[PDB]
Amino acid sequence: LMGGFGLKNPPPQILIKNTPVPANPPAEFSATKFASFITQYSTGQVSVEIEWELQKENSKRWNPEVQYTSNYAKSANVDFTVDNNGLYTEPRPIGTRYLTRPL
Amino acid sequence: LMGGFGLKNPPPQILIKNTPVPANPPAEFSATKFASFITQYSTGQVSVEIEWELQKENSKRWNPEVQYTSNYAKSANVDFTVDNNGLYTEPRPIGTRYLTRPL
Amino acid sequence: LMGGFGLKNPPPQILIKNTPVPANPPAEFSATKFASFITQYSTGQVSVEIEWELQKENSKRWNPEVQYTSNYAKSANVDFTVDNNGLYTEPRPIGTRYLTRPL
């Protein structure tokens, strides 16, 4: 109901954690397991590559259709670019229903 | 007498220690061996994989048998799960004598 | 809406009757067919054998699940057995929704 593709077997969840590396244990044994760990974190890169199957229009409409254009005007800030201090902003939501076809 | 499997040749003991890495020896020689070591410890992972041979029931009992069920009730803490601050608890001992067979 | 398996071609109806064996007809002919039959009935055995395809659980649940157990208590009459004079009784309805899986 939010829109999208309903999938019985969706893309599976990729779960990730840091392996716990404990600090120094005491000299004698104690079975109350571990509260002392080495405070750490990880970083890295992650790349996702989805292939999408397109469906071409077969339209026999005569007149021009409605497009998603950018307003060519004297603007202070370009749409869908970064700001004066590098904040990336998205000025409006873009749907996907622009082309037409008969019912 | 504690229960379990009596084994003449049990699983052998795996013993592990840190190799002693000494600190700086003196300039001249002394044969009173070593009291000065580098204070260290190790960590790692360990995985044990036992394969178990099951014995299926061949029961011709009619009525239902006694099972190990969890009490479905409004509970504050689920049995055999962690607490509000991550302490794993086991609420009761579970035996293994639930199925029946004639003597 | 009663539950079960909706079938376009269900198991076909097996219909059975006793063949009418008439009593003595009169000496002369009469075309008013027959009201006098030999009062009889049949008995026999009937065996039905359905094969059912099961679907195993693939559950990665940790804690124990809810089962159908029989109450182990000092009982006067065992559930789903016969009485003191051989009446077979079923004490409660048993559904089939006991195992769990995520939605």
Side-chain angles (χ1 to χ4, degrees):
Chain A
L1 301 177
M2 289 184 181
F5 299 97
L7 296 176
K8 296 183 189 294
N9 299 319
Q13 285 174 344
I14 300 99
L15 291 99
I16 183 168
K17 80 181 295 293
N18 294 117
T19 300
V21 177
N24 50 352
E28 290 183 355
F29 176 69
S30 178
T32 302
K33 51 184 290 182
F34 278 108
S36 296
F37 294 103
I38 292 172
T39 303
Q40 71 186 1
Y41 71 101
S42 62
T43 185
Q45 275 74 242
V46 55
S47 69
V48 190
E49 182 181 359
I50 302 177
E51 173 182 357
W52 302 86
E53 186 180 3
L54 302 179
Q55 183 178 0
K56 302 286 105 178
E57 70 171 2
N58 205 2
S59 179
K60 197 64 75 174
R61 183 178 174 172
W62 183 259
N63 53 2
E65 59 267 17
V66 181
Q67 299 280 305
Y68 182 74
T69 186
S70 295
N71 205 169
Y72 179 75
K74 297 296 286 182
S75 176
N77 192 0
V78 181
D79 289 331
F80 292 95
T81 60
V82 298
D83 294 335
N84 285 317
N85 52 2
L87 293 174
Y88 177 76
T89 60
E90 293 176 348
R92 65 183 62 88
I94 303 169
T96 190
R97 297 183 191 275
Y98 284 93
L99 293 176
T100 59
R101 68 183 298 165
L103 201 152
Chain B
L1 301 177
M2 289 184 181
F5 299 97
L7 296 176
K8 296 183 189 294
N9 299 319
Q13 285 174 344
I14 300 99
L15 291 99
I16 183 168
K17 80 181 295 293
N18 294 117
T19 300
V21 177
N24 50 352
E28 290 183 355
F29 176 69
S30 178
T32 302
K33 51 184 290 182
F34 278 108
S36 296
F37 294 103
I38 292 172
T39 303
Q40 71 186 1
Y41 71 101
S42 62
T43 185
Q45 275 74 242
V46 55
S47 69
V48 190
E49 182 181 359
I50 302 177
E51 173 182 357
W52 302 86
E53 186 180 3
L54 302 179
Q55 183 178 0
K56 302 286 105 178
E57 70 171 2
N58 205 2
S59 179
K60 197 64 75 174
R61 183 178 174 172
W62 183 259
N63 53 2
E65 59 267 17
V66 181
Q67 299 280 305
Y68 182 74
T69 186
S70 295
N71 205 169
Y72 179 75
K74 297 296 286 182
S75 176
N77 192 0
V78 181
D79 289 331
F80 292 95
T81 60
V82 298
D83 294 335
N84 285 317
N85 52 2
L87 293 174
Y88 177 76
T89 60
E90 293 176 348
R92 65 183 62 88
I94 303 169
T96 190
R97 297 183 191 275
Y98 284 93
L99 293 176
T100 59
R101 68 183 298 165
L103 201 152
Chain C
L1 301 177
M2 289 184 181
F5 299 97
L7 296 176
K8 296 183 189 294
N9 299 319
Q13 285 174 344
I14 300 99
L15 291 99
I16 183 168
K17 80 181 295 293
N18 294 117
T19 300
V21 177
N24 50 352
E28 290 183 355
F29 176 69
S30 178
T32 302
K33 51 184 290 182
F34 278 108
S36 296
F37 294 103
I38 292 172
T39 303
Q40 71 186 1
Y41 71 101
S42 62
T43 185
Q45 275 74 242
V46 55
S47 69
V48 190
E49 182 181 359
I50 302 177
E51 173 182 357
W52 302 86
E53 186 180 3
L54 302 179
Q55 183 178 0
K56 302 286 105 178
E57 70 171 2
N58 205 2
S59 179
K60 197 64 75 174
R61 183 178 174 172
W62 183 259
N63 53 2
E65 59 267 17
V66 181
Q67 299 280 305
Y68 182 74
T69 186
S70 295
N71 205 169
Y72 179 75
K74 297 296 286 182
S75 176
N77 192 0
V78 181
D79 289 331
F80 292 95
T81 60
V82 298
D83 294 335
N84 285 317
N85 52 2
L87 293 174
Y88 177 76
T89 60
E90 293 176 348
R92 65 183 62 88
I94 303 169
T96 190
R97 297 183 191 275
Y98 284 93
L99 293 176
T100 59
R101 68 183 298 165
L103 201 152

